[PDB]
């Protein structure tokens, strides 16, 4: 009767932040490799 839905789409879109800003250092490293 008092069952509200769970919403973690806050931390999930936190993970998706961490992942995109990993991908944009990876393209940083591969910048310095293409430098060599």
């Amino acid at each position: 009767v008092a069952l509200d839905p769970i919403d973690i789409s806050x931390v999930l879109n936190x993970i998706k932040x961490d992942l995109e800003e990993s991908k944009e250092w990876i393209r940083x490293s591969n910048x310095k490799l293409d430098x060599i």
Partner: protein
Amino acid sequence: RSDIEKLKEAIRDTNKAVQSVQSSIGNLIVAIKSVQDYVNKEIVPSIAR
């Protein structure tokens, strides 16, 4: 010229390993989101009915 070339290629392979890991995390997001929607849209309404 040979050692620097090899080191550069080693870093390139490591980056490709990280990219595959990044793809794993992206799919992990989809899996967790799928569980959330199933609980909110199928389980919770089934209990309230």
